[model samples]
Target: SKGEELFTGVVPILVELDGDVNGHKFSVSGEGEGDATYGKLTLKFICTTGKLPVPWPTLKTTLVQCFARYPDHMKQHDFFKSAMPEGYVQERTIFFKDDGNYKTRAEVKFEGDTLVNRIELKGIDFKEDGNILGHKLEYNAISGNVNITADKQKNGIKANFKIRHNIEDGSVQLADHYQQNTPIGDGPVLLPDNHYLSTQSKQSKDPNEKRDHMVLLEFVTAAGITL
Candidate 1:
């Protein structure tokens, strides 16, 4: 029962955002313990803003908006256009308040016939907020599978979501340097490295302005084979 007891177990994968390096700390939790056989996978996005100056409300709005925009932009990418299934859409929402206090929430869903896979991003709270206040975005909770097959059969799959802000300089920052998660030539095409994803970031004073912004993404599904 080694595989049975541990195969379907969940593991905590810690992704540390070094302040000195990435200037953020976010954690993503997922369930996947299969060894050689097929199994199910579920991932959730968790973000903790440790001593960050940005207001919690602004962060929440930014995240909710980012998730909503992912699918729309994916359509323009050649790689995503070919790999992503037809009619596939990603929906998210913000359920919490935007005040300096409290956490922000959002959920993502992918639709399928019989069975459905869902991912939720919740319990997001910021550690510290500086002078930044207010919000510029919003969202709604969603639940569904990003990859759906007939009868919702479990199959090997890959999903990637990235966001960027259109900075004033006509450049973009890969929404908190998320561009690093993409494969060299994989799906979810993004702005070139030279561009800043957010237009509001063009006036950044920091030397690493292009790499400062961040977005939280969660991936969930079942794996049938290795690529």
Candidate 2:
């Protein structure tokens, strides 16, 4: 009784399965029956960004603009596929400046929910006296924070600052730390009060906040700039 219906006539069959393999999600669908092999099978792959996904067109245009700004620094691997699934994220890092001892680099990433941009400079001899300087700047969309750091040669000077904006509550916070060294008769002397200070403000209505929000929107527009 378990093995009945041997004289079936062209029985229609369908099967489907969805699961994850080695951390990647996938699906399979087919229409077949019996122990014999069959045709017409469909397979699909699914990917996610872990956050939200930004429009591909917007992300692509912004990246193109960035490339156009520094064409010389462009590389073959800097570009992404013309068409990618929604929620895809891509990142590229390029060196904008490379002059033997000095260098500057920029890193940009496209995300579904936010953007991350960073710039770094090293061995910048502002005075041409072998006293090099370094600086780093970073911006994050989700956190709405901008961080900056600058430092000169040993025993020279240094400064660090962070500015963060809270979109939900309309608040802003700023933290800063600075230090300097002055040249004495023989050596450099460190300045006093090299400590961090933080300040916060809450605003029901702020003009700067509106401007910043607009700028962020423009940053992702086709004709706008990229971080």
Candidate 3:
């Protein structure tokens, strides 16, 4: 399915299906449902850079790091740590989980457009006592597509995508699955962090707490149509 491709490719591995991404620098967490075969993967990156940076190669590299470090917890696969390049840090920890029915969390920091520190992602493809659980797939399904949009006011870069069982309904349709009011964007929607509001008080105490919604970056299909 299109969703699966987007999920694997673009969804930050930390935020990829489970928790943090980019060596665990950025943080993400959410829960939702879909058809039995096709699952939904949505990810968000809190903009760390105050000014929009061009030549987004740095952003791409940072994203790749997030996807690369995701499998440490599954298959008892702890061997990759030694082979990692310099300045790369990896850690094993448990994020909030609930028998495969909950969202995960991750935390990392960013400096301007450059990823100064590792972006941490948590609880990806939850495992128990070092045993892999459901929804485990090969690494080929994890990938990304980079899009750079130039907007001075929207002065930061955020990428989002999903992965699912490969299918052919065209690039993933944002409206078909997500809630009706879910905000959509042409490039990346960089809003003031405190713009949106949350429904529950327990989630946040700050009156200025903004609801971090998904940024919909559109794509064109092979058939010459926009998705």
Candidate 4:
């Protein structure tokens, strides 16, 4: 048995972040997803603010807000705060889209928990990687009680290791873009709009306005891994 799955699972990466969004110490509460089997995580930070125009700092993305100061009115006002293109919001709910690549960064900094990385994909002890017909696969030829194989025919690959729930306080699983067996998306992750952000992004934004928001992005954990 050589290349057999020995473990796999996804857990939440307790995200606590701190950084500067508009030259100010912006704090926000965030959430994220982590998979130890694969080795990658996605975080979304929620930022909320009231009607602007008072020297208020906004995101570096597109925005949609309610129009006029009337009662029970449902009209959204689209605007831009920065000189760069921005992400749009749902009038009351705004979401920033960041792919986290070079130059095209969302200016996010992490200061939280968990070990998130693609160790499994980069540290696999496989003996061969091949293709069958129009299919791609990789298998280990080692002689032992652990046989492993990652085929591209399962939507495509999965590893059922001889183990149980190994998730703990801080276990970050980073399934990089290479590993073909991850349950998450291609790399990092995004919503229907296509944005691989680095904060608790899946959750709705605009938690609270009127007052200063605390969207602290926590990415630290007892165990740590950065992809």
TM-score of each candidate?
0.22, 0.18, 0.22, 0.22
RMSD of each: 17.0, 25.8, 20.6, 24.3
Which residue pairs in candidate 2 have backbone atoms (N, alpha carbon, C) closer than 3 angstroms, thus clashing?
A: 52-112, 53-112, 54-112
Q: Between the candidate structures 2 and 4, which one is better when assessed by TM-score?
A: 4
Off by over 4 Å in 4: 1-7, 36-113, 116-227
Top model number, TM-score: 1
Give the Cα lDDT of each candidate: 0.25, 0.21, 0.23, 0.21
Superposed Cα deviation of residue 52, candidate 3 (Å): 35
Summarize candidate 2's per-residue lDDT along 33-138 as a digit string, tens digits: 2210111112111112231121111111111111111111121111111111111122222111221122323233323312222323232213222111121212
Q: Give the Å shift of residue 27 in candidate 2.
A: 45
lDDT of 1: 0.25
* Predicted candidate 4 versus true structure: per-residue lDDT over 95-192, tens digit per residue: 11111110111221112323222110011111122111111212111111111133333322221111111122332211112112222223221111
Off by over 4 Å in 3: 1-116, 124-132, 147-154, 165-227
CA-RMSD of model 2 = 25.8
Q: How high a TM-score does candidate 2 get? A: 0.18
**Could you tell me the lDDT of residue 110 within candidate 3?**
24
Q: For model 3, what is the error of residue 151's alpha carbon versus the real structure, in angstroms, after optimal superposition?
A: 6.9
Instruction: Please give the distance, in angstroms, between residue 90's alpha carbon in candidate 4 and its true position after superposition.
Output: 31
**Poorly placed runs, candidate 1 (over 4 Å):** 1-8, 19-51, 55-134, 139-219, 222-227
